[PDB]
Design a protein around this ligand. Structure first.
Ligand SMILES: CCCCCCCCCCCCCCCCCC(=O)OC[C@H](COP(=O)([O-])OCC(O)COP(=O)([O-])OC[C@@H](COC(=O)CCCCCCCCCCCCCCCCC)OC(=O)CCCCCCCCCCCCCCCCC)OC(=O)CCCCCCCCCCCCCCCCC
Ligand SMILES: CCCCCCCCCCCCCCCCCC(=O)OC[C@H](COP(=O)([O-])OCC[N+](C)(C)C)OC(=O)CCCCCCCCCCCCCCCCC
Ligand SMILES: CCCCCCCCCCCCCCCCCC(=O)OC[C@H](COP(=O)([O-])OCC[N+](C)(C)C)OC(=O)CCCCCCCCCCCCCCCCC
Ligand SMILES: CCCCCCCCCCCCCCCCCC(=O)OC[C@H](COP(=O)(O)OCCN)OC(=O)CCCCCCCCCCCCCCCCC
Ligand SMILES: CCCCCCCCCCCCCCCCCC(=O)OC[C@H](COP(=O)(O)OCCN)OC(=O)CCCCCCCCCCCCCCCCC
Ligand SMILES: CCCCCCCCCCCCCCCCCC(=O)OC[C@H](COP(=O)(O)OCCN)OC(=O)CCCCCCCCCCCCCCCCC
Ligand SMILES: CCCCCCCCCCCCCCCCCC(=O)OC[C@H](COP(=O)(O)OCCN)OC(=O)CCCCCCCCCCCCCCCCC
Ligand SMILES: CCCCCCCCCCCCCCCCCC(=O)OC[C@H](COP(=O)(O)OCCN)OC(=O)CCCCCCCCCCCCCCCCC
Ligand SMILES: CCCCCCCCCCCCCCCCCC(=O)OC[C@H](COP(=O)(O)OCCN)OC(=O)CCCCCCCCCCCCCCCCC
Ligand SMILES: CCCCCCCCCCCC(=O)OC[C@H](COP(=O)(O)OCC[N+](C)(C)C)OC(=O)CCCCCCCCCCC
Ligand SMILES: CCCCCCCCCCCC(=O)OC[C@H](COP(=O)(O)OCC[N+](C)(C)C)OC(=O)CCCCCCCCCCC
Ligand SMILES: Nc1nc2c(ncn2[C@H]2C[C@H](O)[C@@H](COP(=O)(O)OP(=O)(O)OP(=O)(O)O)O2)c(=O)[nH]1
Ligand SMILES: [Mg+2]
Lengths: 98, 120, 347, 140, 55, 88, 70, 99, 320, 49
């Protein structure tokens, strides 16, 4: 657990705390999801590259493939939210009551 | 608790060792009740679709009874197999660890003292 | 939506779940959830109205966050054990994140706020998938990692779910919100017996699915989504109100109905492990569930609410809804207590 | 929370009431901060000072209840020379219930809180003596 | 005094009154993504600082 | 819900409050029944400006057919109360 | 007499947004009968651009005011 | 009116149409057979034959036998000088008291 | 087989059976304006199916044996009593109008099913899109309450949105005095009580609210009483319509498949016509509704699903 | 002909009837054969017949 793992794990925590504290824009939160995937990619790549786990070297790539699917999926929902209210504000997403 | 049992028959509905056990009798009371549940399904099917409950579609009612009994027979074979395996492991373990299951020293009520509590 | 595209997207939802159940590698488990979320959302957006858009967006945001925590658990578990096998995790911090990720996916309290809202915002058919099929994959993972799950964490979530689910269901008149809070409460029973006997988790899940699928099928038949809409059923399909009565009584855990079996077996396993205070509290708190099921029987079957004149026009047409497996499901959801020892097949 | 509870249960009953009051007040105060966090998060305060005021209102109610329980349940077990007696916790629990009534300005809540908090405190003490497990470790 | 008031007012009437009051607290929610996820953050911090679920 | 409802005392206070911010009206000359033209000395366009201030205060649109008759503060109170169903 | 059955007063208790009205839920209203909310008032913001006069393709003295969507 | 509801029906006195009514049904044919089954199975069978059956139960709870047995033992013990009834139900020889 | 996803996937697609003659035509006008005669002729010349104007007993004509049922099985709504006493307290005015909308809504679904299932056009008389003229007339004359109009819009708002408007709207304009004079000639004792003010409210709704609304979505053809007699001229105008506007140009196989699934499930078409809104006009007590429902199920051939009634000669129930 | 519109279930769907009755017979024959084979194997493995 070298000093690099500290910053990488702190990056994930920052992006997680960033995702759980919305300001207004749904797009601002989507960036935090893509930020979290970046931290997991780096953390997984470091561990795999350092341990010479040869076959695991493809896992980070497969992690980016499904990060794009989620990112594209999140953008597609952002289009429909914008088309209904003219903004991507999350406070408009309150028609459904708990 | 028996998920990892030593029996190397994983993801098999009925392991071949289950063929040493008696099959359920076709007159098994559990199998008759399963068949009865099929008959109730037939009648409820007629009622929700507004048909003569007892008479409508006797062909469909028979398939309800047969389908339930057919599936019920195999669920009973697997049910009895799993309980047979449970006792097999329990007795083997007790035999393999005699110190944990000693034969208690027998006593008679003429020798064992039990406190008496009057009801008055 | 093109019928062929609907079928393909439906099979993709199942494939994601099936990948999670057959995967022995953590990466494939994560791929299963991602595939499952990718295919579920278009079925939520099918009717394309603002409420469905909000429901899909809230669902996506919650599930996406959970999948990030699950991947963090897998990577942390990789750093401390150097292997990807789907078994007990090898780090306490990995277990907490995976347990919480699986709690968010299931909608357990205090990660429950989306379940009432997502269910309300999507059609009944989509809601049935949300509350029955989406629970198979997360429950599959908990079944395999339970040795390492912190006992306090899992039992705390179970107790909160039973409380919040019961209380939330009292203040509801929308059927989709009633079924949503009922689902949260039942998740508590599944995960409360998990540390003691994972087999009984499967039993309660199977019985919960059958009963839940029966209620949605009967709500789907009459296109009823509110208490008052369901209150007209006696004047159109009298038989359907009796089936709703029996199923609702079963969901409340009243013997001799089927739904009493999972409570009865869960209390047995917990009392064998000298857990007495928790089963008693869980059973008593479950009376909150039985109260707002009884309230539905009162306005549906045991009384006759006011009707409207146009109802007379509906008497001249039959039910054209498919109502697939409803006659079989209603019987399995009411008369299965005599076959209780058949729970051994799940072992 | 494991640390504070172990501190509370290590002090023998009816002794060092100044320390036990510290322990219970910590437990109650922490409970009032957990309630304030969710209340502030789910019911957004209209202003920062309105939310700090709410946090101080709940945290003081929970701290006062915890302080009165440990104080009243410790002197009672000291005067009576009866440490292992659930009646001491029953007295302590009801006193905490009364404090809840005073803070809520409701006589009805004071009576109900005294009755149910009194029973709960007594049941907690019995479980400590008998060995009752709320979250029991799997054994079979 | 006893049958119609006090025997009602202790067991059945108070117990019912509490569940109705706890039901409103649970359900009276603003339906805002911002507030729900903020509570998720509180849960994770409490689960580690207070209850030590990560060990 | 919980916000206090509208009362004729409340409407009267707000109407007299707007008329005091108007620069062409002497604050110690405004009577709740004083005529805008005869007493305060205002002209047609001054009255139009007052009505627009009322729209901003009470947040509803006053057409010209109706605004042409509101020639004193009390008539404004009646019109606002009448259109807001405040019978109190 | 005749068996009692619920009247309109009784049934309308179950027609509200919630079963237990409070101050917070006083302005809640039941959702639409078919889950479809009214579309929001048209707020399409077209982008207005001066295309000329000082523009190579405007022939020098044309001020073409264009509403653009994209 | 607040709704379209049928006016409350008045009660039907079964005596008006059938002065010989037994109170069971409107139909005289059903009414008479309802009465016959109740009386025949209720009074002529259950109460009369059940009463006779209970009267002749074969020594219910073995109480008559215990009287003959007591007489036999009392005669045997008085004819041999043994006590009528002892204070110990079990022979102490089989009892092994502690220490 | 029964139409569904399987049939659509196997080739039963609406466009493959719809041609340039697969048009839905509606004939509109005031009371006694020749709509029935004009509509019936346009159906024969163009080879289109004709739907007589939906009345109180339309639904009875499509189910069972097709004969009208007693009037208790229709809410006791009477067009006769509306004319005699349009302000009765038993709520017969709006109860009639609400019932008629459900009948037009049902007929329109029947019309769409025929058009989408065989490709043949249909001719209607006063479809759901024009039924609001009578409502606007009843309200302006004090025949129904304000709350009743609120109920009508709520039911209409959640039903009208699911269907497509007719391709061509034929309107037969007639000034009110001509109608009033024509009504008296017809010599129907009840219809003759229609005041002129009522007929003028219908006129204002038709021109001012309806035709402008339908002009932007349909091919609106207007004809006077004198030029409406020769149906040949009207048919010629229809044959040479461009059909350059309306939602029908945006429909494809997927959209029409979803539409056909709705219009064939009649209970789904009528789902929202009985929303739980408790108006005295339409609300029916439990005791009354229970009694009437029991009587309905004991009519010949209506206790069981059609095809399973022995009393009407059905056979093979045990194999069906 | 009582109904104005031919019911969807006016006459039996003889295709379903044959499959339905045929399916039931097959399952019963399969089950009876399964039971006999199970009994023979049981006795063979336990050496009692
Ligand atoms: C291997 C062993 C499997 C045993 C089951 C075999 C029968 C299942 C297939 C029959 C079928 O079509 O039902 C599937 C299913 C039935 O759903 P359904 O519409 O609710 O059935 C009622 C209809 O009214 C059905 O009415 P219908 O008029 O539309 O069709 C008549 C139908 C009538 O078929 C039936 O009898 C329906 C009931 C059979 C299915 C019962 C469920 C399966 C039974 C096991 C579950 C119970 C478990 C045991 C009890 C609990 C534990 C002991 O007969 C057939 O279609 C013959 C098909 C032969 C192939 O149809 C499908 O859509 C899936 C295909
Ligand atoms: C499609 C799969 C998703 C739908 C089923 C979702 C139900 C999940 C919970 C209940 C699972 C059923 C219980 C296990 C079982 O009896 O079947 C596996 C049984 C027994 O498998 P097993 O004994 O090796 O254990 C596997 C399942 N667990 C560990 C959960 C118990 O095997 C089969 O039936 C498969 C053979 C037939 C293959 C076709
Ligand atoms: C492991 C098992 C788990 C069990 C879980 C049990 C869950 C039940 C817990 C529910 C507690 C809810 C308490 C709510 C209190 C509300 C008070 C309030 O708001 O004011 C109401 C009222 C004041 O309200 P009010 O002033 O507006 O007027 C009330 C009258 N009406 C309704 C007309 C307005 O005050 C009370 O009446 C409270 C009574 C206090 C006395 C309570 C004593 C209870 C003791 C137990 C029952 C006794 C029999 C058992 C004996 C056992 C002997 C060992
Ligand atoms: C040891 C390892 C440490 C790991 C954690 C590192 C985190 C460091 C901080 C970097 C991450 C920033 C998180 C994002 C914060 C945020 O987005 O705030 C949003 C929220 C909304 O504010 P707004 O909509 O603009 O309205 C005004 C209300 N004040 O704004 C607010 O309401 C107030 C903003 C306060 C921001 C402080 C966040 C730090 C505390 C988070 C918990 C720490 C765990
Ligand atoms: C509620 C009840 C719902 C019931 C739903 C139906 C599920 C039971 C289906 C049983 C059908 C039996 C088919 C006939 C058996 C057969 O011929 O074998 C088919 C197949 C192969 O058998 P196999 O064991 O793999 O081969 C071994 C060879 N050495 O083996 C199979 O295909 C087995 C069938 C698939 C597995 C079905 C699920 C098994 C677990 C039962 C779930 C239901 C639990 C009910 C618990 C209720 C508690 C009261
Ligand atoms: C008299 C008043 C008493 C004060 C409260 C009692 C304090 C002592 C409680 C305690 O046991 O300490 C717990 C914690 C200290 O941390 P710890 O490392 O656990 O110290 C050892 C503790 N045995 O101290 C605590 O934090 C206890 C209070 C818990 C607060 C939880 C509130 C939610 C935290 C998240 C804040 C909101 C979200 C943050 C992001 C928003 C922007 C800031
Ligand atoms: C961070 C905690 C969550 C939060 O944002 O609280 C904000 C609250 C009031 O902030 P406010 O300006 O009203 O935000 C309005 C946004 N529409 O302000 C507060 O944070 C009140 C709670 C402060 C913390 C209590 C003291 C410790
Ligand atoms: C860690 C400690 C966190 C402290 C909370 C943040 C500081 C709060 C500052 C005061 C805010 C204003 C306020 O109202 O709180 C004062 C509080 C008593 O609350 P009170 O004013 O009486 O409200 C009416 C009661 N019905 O009086 C208080 O007790 C405030 C301090 C609470 C902590 C006391 C712990 C013992
Ligand atoms: C507000 C929150 C703050 C107040 C609550 C905190 C104080 C109570 C904590 C419980 C005390 C505890 O944690 O210690 C366990 C206690 C004995 O502890 P100890 O002696 O150290 O064990 C070793 C013995 N060889 O043993 C016991 O606690 C006995 C448990 C008895 C429980 C009786 C409760 C009856 C009512 C049911 C409530 C619990 C179920 C509800 C769900 C709980 C979810 C957490
Ligand atoms: C420094 C060391 C201190 C040690 C103290 C020892 C503990 C004493 C604590 C007293 C707290 C206090 O003051 O209680 C006082 C409160 C009073 O009610 P309130 O809400 O204030 O009324 C305020 C009303 N206004 C707002 C109008 C002013 O009691 C109560 O509600 C109790 C009243 C009901 C009686 C309950 C008993 C019957 C039920 C029990 C059945 C088993
Ligand atoms: C599906 C399960 C069948 C049973 C069922 O339930 O299928 C539902 C529907 C049938 O419903 P229906 O049209 O009403 O016919 C049934 C009712 N009838 C007879 C009264 C009208 O089948 C389908 O759409 C299945 C279409 C299969 C084509 C698949 C496309 C290729 C997939 C490629 C994957 C990569
Ligand atoms: N209240 C009400 N009456 C209606 C409605 N539709 C028809 N009617 C009534 C009005 C008339 O009195 C009667 C027939 O109306 P018509 O439009 O068909 O006129 P008529 O058939 O007599 O001559 P015509 O077909 O136009 O040549 O039915 C309706 O939707 N609401
Ligand atoms: Mg006509």
């Amino acid at each position: 657990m070298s000093m690099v793992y500290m910053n990488i794990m702190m990056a994930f925590t920052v992006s997680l705390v960033g995702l759980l504290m919305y300001r207004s824009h749904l797009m601002s939160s989507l960036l935090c999801l893509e930020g979290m995937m970046l931290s997991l990619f780096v953390m997984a790549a470091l561990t795999i590259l350092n341990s010479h786990f040869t076959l695991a070297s493809m896992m980070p790539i497969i992690l980016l493939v499904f990060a794009a699917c989620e990112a594209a999926l999140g953008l597609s929902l952002l289009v429909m939210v914008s088309n209904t209210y003219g903004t991507d504000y999350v406070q408009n997403l309150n028609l459904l009551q708990c | 608790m028996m998920t990892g049992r030593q029996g190397r028959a994983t993801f098999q509905f009925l392991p071949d060792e289950a063929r040493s056990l008696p099959p359920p009798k076709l007159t098994d009371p559990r199998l008759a009740f399963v068949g009865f549940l099929g008959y109730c399904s037939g009648l409820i099917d007629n009622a929700i679709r507004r048909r003569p409950v007892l008479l409508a579609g006797l062909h469909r009612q028979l398939l309800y009874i047969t389908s339930f009994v057919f599936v019920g027979y195999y669920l009973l074979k697997r049910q009895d197999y799993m309980y047979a395996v449970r006792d097999h492991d329990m007795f083997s373990y007790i035999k393999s660890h005699p110190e944990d299951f000693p034969e208690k020293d027998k006593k008679t009520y003429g020798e064992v003292f039990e406190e008496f509590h009057p009801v008055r | 939506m093109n019928p062929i595209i609907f079928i393909i997207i439906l099979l993709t939802i199942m494939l994601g779940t099936i990948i999670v159940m057959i995967s022995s590698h953590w990466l494939l488990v994560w791929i299963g959830f991602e595939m499952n979320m990718l295919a579920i959302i278009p079925i939520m957006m099918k009717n394309h109205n603002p409420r469905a858009t909000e429901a899909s967006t809230k669902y996506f945001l919650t599930q996406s966050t959970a999948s990030m925590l699950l991947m963090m658990a897998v990577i942390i578990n990789l750093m401390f054990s150097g292997q990807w096998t789907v078994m007990k995790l090898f780090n306490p911090m990995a277990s907490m994140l995976m347990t919480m990720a699986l709690a968010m996916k299931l909608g357990m309290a205090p990660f429950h706020f989306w379940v009432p809202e997502v269910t309300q915002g999507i059609p009944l058919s989509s809601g049935l998938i949300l509350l029955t099929w989406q629970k198979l994959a997360p429950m599959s993972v908990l079944y395999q990692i339970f040795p390492s799950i912190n006992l306090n964490l899992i039992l705390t979530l179970s107790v909160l779910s039973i409380l919040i689910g019961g209380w939330g269901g009292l203040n509801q008149t929308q059927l989709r919100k009633i079924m949503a809070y009922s689902s949260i409460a039942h998740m508590g029973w599944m995960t409360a017996v998990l540390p003691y006997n994972p087999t009984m988790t499967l039993l309660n899940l199977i019985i919960y699915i059958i009963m839940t699928s029966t209620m949605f099928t009967m709500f789907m038949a009459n296109s009823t989504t509110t208490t008052l809409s369901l209150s007209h059923t006696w004047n159109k399909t009298p038989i359907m109100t009796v089936l709703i009565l029996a199923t609702l009584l079963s969901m409340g855990g009243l013997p001799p109905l089927s739904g009493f079996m999972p409570k009865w077996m869960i209390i047995q396993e917990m009392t064998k492990n000298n857990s007495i205070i928790l089963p008693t509290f869980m059973a008593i708190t479950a009376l909150l569930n039985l109260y707002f099921y009884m309230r539905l029987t009162y306005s549906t079957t045991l009384t006759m609410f006011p009707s409207t004149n146009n109802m007379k026009m509906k008497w001249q047409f039959p039910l054209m809804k498919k109502m697939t497996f409803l006659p079989t499901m209603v019987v399995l959801s009411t008369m299965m207590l005599p076959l209780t020892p058949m729970l051994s097949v799940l072992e | 929370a494991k640390t504070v509870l172990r501190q509370y249960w290590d002090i023998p009953e009816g002794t060092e009431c100044h320390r036990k009051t510290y322990a219970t007040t910590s437990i109650g105060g922490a409970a009032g901060l957990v309630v304030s966090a969710y209340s502030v998060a789910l019911k957004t305060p209209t202003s920062f000072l309105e939310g700090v005021a709410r946090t101080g209102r709940y945290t003081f109610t929970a701290a006062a209840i915890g302080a009165i329980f440990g104080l009243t349940s410790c002197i009672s077990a000291q005067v009576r020379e009866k440490p292992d007696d659930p009646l001491n916790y029953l007295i302590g629990g009801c006193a905490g219930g009364l404090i809840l009534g005073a803070r809520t300005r409701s006589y009805g809540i004071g009576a109900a809180a005294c009755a149910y908090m009194g029973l709960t405190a007594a049941l907690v003490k019995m479980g400590q003596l008998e060995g009752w497990q709320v979250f029991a470790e799997p054994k079979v | 005094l006893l049958d119609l008031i006090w025997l009602e007012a202790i067991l059945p009437k108070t117990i019912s009154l509490a569940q109705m009051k706890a039901s409103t607290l649970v359900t009276n929610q603003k339906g805002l993504i911002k507030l729900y996820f903020l509570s998720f953050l509180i849960t994770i911090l409490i689960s580690m600082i207070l209850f030590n679920f990560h060990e | 819900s919980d916000a206090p409802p509208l009362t004729l005392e409340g409407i009267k206070d707000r109407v007299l409050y707007v008329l005091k911010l108007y620069d062409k009206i002497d604050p110690e000359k405004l009577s709740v029944n004083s005529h805008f033209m005869k007493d305060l000395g205002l002209d047609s366009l001054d009255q139009v400006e007052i009505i627009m201030a009322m729209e901003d205060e009470f947040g509803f649109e006053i057409p010209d057919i109706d605004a042409e008759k509101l020639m004193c503060p009390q008539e404004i109170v009646d019109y606002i109360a009448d259109k807001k169903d405040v019978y109190e | 007499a005749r068996q009692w059955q619920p009247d309109v007063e009784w049934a309308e208790q179950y027609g509200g947004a919630v079963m237990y009205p409070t101050k917070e839920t006083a302005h809640w209203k039941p959702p639409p009968w078919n889950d479809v909310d009214p579309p929001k008032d048209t707020l399409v913001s077209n982008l207005t651009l001066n295309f000329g006069p000082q523009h190579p393709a405007a022939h020098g003295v044309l001020r073409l005011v264009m509403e653009l969507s994209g | 009116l607040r709704w379209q509801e049928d006016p409350e029906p008045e009660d039907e006195n079964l005596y008006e149409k059938n002065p010989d009514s037994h109170g069971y049904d409107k139909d005289p044919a059903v009414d008479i057979w309802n009465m016959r089954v109740v009386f025949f199975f209720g009074f002529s069978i259950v109460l009369v034959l059940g009463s006779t059956f209970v009267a002749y139960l074969p020594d219910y709870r073995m109480q008559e036998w215990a009287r003959r047995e007591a007489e036999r033992l009392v005669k045997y013990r008085e004819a041999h000088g043994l006590p009528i009834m002892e204070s110990n139900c079990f022979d102490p020889s089989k009892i092994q008291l502690p220490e | 087989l029964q139409y569904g996803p399987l049939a659509y996937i196997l080739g039963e697609k609406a466009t493959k059976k719809m041609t340039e003659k697969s048009k839905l035509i509606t004939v509109d006008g005031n009371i006694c304006s020749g709509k029935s005669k004009l509509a019936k002729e346009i159906a024969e010349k163009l080879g289109l199916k004709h739907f007589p104007e939906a009345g109180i007993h339309y639904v009875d004509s499509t189910t069972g044996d097709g004969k009208p049922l007693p009037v208790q099985f229709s809410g006791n709504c009477s067009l006769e009593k509306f004319y005699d006493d349009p302000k009765s307290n038993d709520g017969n005015s709006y109860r009639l109008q609400a019932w008629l909308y459900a009948s037009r809504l049902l007929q329109y679904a029947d019309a769409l099913e025929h058009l989408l299932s065989t490709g043949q056009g249909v001719v209607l008389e006063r479809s759901i899109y024009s039924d609001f003229v009578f409502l606007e007339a009843m309200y302006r004359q004090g025949f129904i309450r304000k709350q009743c109009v609120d109920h009508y819009n709520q039911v209409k708002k959640v039903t009208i949105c699911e269907y497509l408007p007719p391709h061509v709207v034929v309107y037969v304009d007639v000034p009110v005095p001509e109608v009033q004079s024509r009504i008296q000639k017809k010599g129907n004792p009840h219809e003759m009580k229609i005041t002129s003010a009522y007929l003028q409210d219908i006129e204002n709704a038709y021109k001012g609210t309806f035709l402008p609304e339908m002009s932007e979505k349909c091919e609106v053809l207007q004809y006077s009483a004198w030029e409406a007699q020769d149906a040949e001229k009207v048919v010629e105008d229809i044959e040479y319509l461009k059909y350059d506007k309306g939602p029908w140009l945006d429909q494809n196989d997927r959209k029409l498949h979803k539409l056909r699934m709705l219009v064939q499930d009649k209970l789904e078409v009528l789902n929202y016509t009985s929303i739980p809104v408790f108006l005295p006009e339409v609300t029916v007590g439990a005791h009354q509704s229970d009694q009437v429902f029991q009587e309905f199920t004991e009519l010949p051939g209506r206790k069981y699903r059609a095809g399973y009634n022995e009393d009407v000669g059905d056979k093979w129930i045990w194999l069906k | 002909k009582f109904y104005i519109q031919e019911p969807p279930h006016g006459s039996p769907n003889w295709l379903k009837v044959g499959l339905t009755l045929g399916t039931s017979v097959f399952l019963w024959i399969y089950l009876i054969k399964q039971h006999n084979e199970d009994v023979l194997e049981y006795k063979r493995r336990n050496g009692l017949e």
